[PDB]
Amino acid sequence: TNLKADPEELFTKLEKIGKGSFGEVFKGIDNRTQKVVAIKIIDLEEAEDEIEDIQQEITVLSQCDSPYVTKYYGSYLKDTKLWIIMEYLGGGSALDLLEPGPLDETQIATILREILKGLDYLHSEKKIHRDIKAANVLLSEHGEVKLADFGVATPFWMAPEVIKQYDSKADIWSLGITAIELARGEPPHSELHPMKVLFLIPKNNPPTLEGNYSKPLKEFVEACLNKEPSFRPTAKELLKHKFILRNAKKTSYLTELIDAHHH
Numbered sequence: 001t002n003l004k005a006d007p008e009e010l011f012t013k014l015e016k017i018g019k020g021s022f023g024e025v026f027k028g029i030d031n032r033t034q035k036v037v038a039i040k041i042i043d044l045e046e047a048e049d050e051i052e053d054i055q056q057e058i059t060v061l062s063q064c065d066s067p068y069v070t071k072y073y074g075s076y077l078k079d080t081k082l083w084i085i086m087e088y089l090g091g092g093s094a095l096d097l098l099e100p101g102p103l104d105e106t107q108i109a110t111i112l113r114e115i116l117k118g119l120d121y122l123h124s125e126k127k128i129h130r131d132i133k134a135a136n137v138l139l140s141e142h143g144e145v146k147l148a149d150f151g152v153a154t155p156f157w158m159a160p161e162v163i164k165q166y167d168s169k170a171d172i173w174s175l176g177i178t179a180i181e182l183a184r185g186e187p188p189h190s191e192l193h194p195m196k197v198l199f200l201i202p203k204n205n206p207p208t209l210e211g212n213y214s215k216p217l218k219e220f221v222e223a224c225l226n227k228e229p230s231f232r233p234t235a236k237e238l239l240k241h242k243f244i245l246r247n248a249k250k251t252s253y254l255t256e257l258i259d260a261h262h263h
């Protein structure tokens with residue numbers, strides 16, 4: 001977290017690539033290497049109790065060294081603005097890639113498998129992602145799949161025990177919801193007011209995947225979406241799930257999904 005270096009000099013800020021947590025995010029250029037980066041700019045005068053959450057997310061990202069976690073390159077403070085520099089992933093989010101139409105089960109399994117590799121990494125490091133969902137899964141222009149936007153230490157992807165106040169198995173529930181989101185376009189209860197969903201997730205039976213999907217995909221979802229966390233499999237075990245093994249293919253095939261999105 002460098003305090004003398006000037007980030008206007010080190011980076012060229014390009015177009016906004018969305019609003020993230022706590023500030024605007026820009027495509028940018030590292031002027032020394034010409035590599036494309038993602039730049040989040042947070043106004044610290046506009047942040048109340050958020051500054052502690054920002055620092056905690058920086059710390060966690062700095063401790064991750066995995067091809068399945070968006071890389072953190074550093075941060076800078078210029079007058080009142082914190083610049084956070086991260087790996088730029090040109091494929092967009094998995095949520096973005098749902099827009100042209102439905103994924104097939106090969107694409108779903110490939111994305112889930114790469115998410116599981118990230119979760120296996122994090123849980124083996126004694127970390128919890130805490131916000132697994134399609135919008136937080138970023139793809140490189142080559143089809144590599146990475147996790148982003150860790151949750152701080154909207155309810156639709158939250159495990160019931162998280163809502164009732166848990167461990168890494170909460171990520172497995174969120175993965176199940178993400179599986180449904182990748183199959184259907186949106187999570188269970190997405191039509192409902194969030195405050196309704198807050199009491200439905202604890203109260204109701206767990207969601208199931210409805211529609212003409214393979215039984216292994218439906219069983220993948222069911223295994224993740226058990227109200228009892230100890231009954232959920234680990235990420236390691238789910239990497240061997242028949243749905244994953246029978247359907248996932250090379251990640252480079254996902255470039256066809258990325259091109260379809262830039263139709």
Ligand SMILES: CNc1ncc2cc(-c3ccc(-c4cccc(C)n4)cc3Cl)c(=O)n(C[C@H]3OC[C@H](N)CO3)c2n1
Nearest residue numbers: 018020025038039040057058086087088089092135136
């Ligand atoms: C479309 N390619 C693409 N490539 C790469 C990144 C990277 C980040 C990123 C993540 C997290 C943070 C970060 C790190 C520590 C603390 C705090 C408070 N934020 C900083 C950035 Cl720079 C991003 O915001 N986006 C955009 C986003 O929009 C929201 C969506 N949920 C995920 O992607 C990216 N987008």
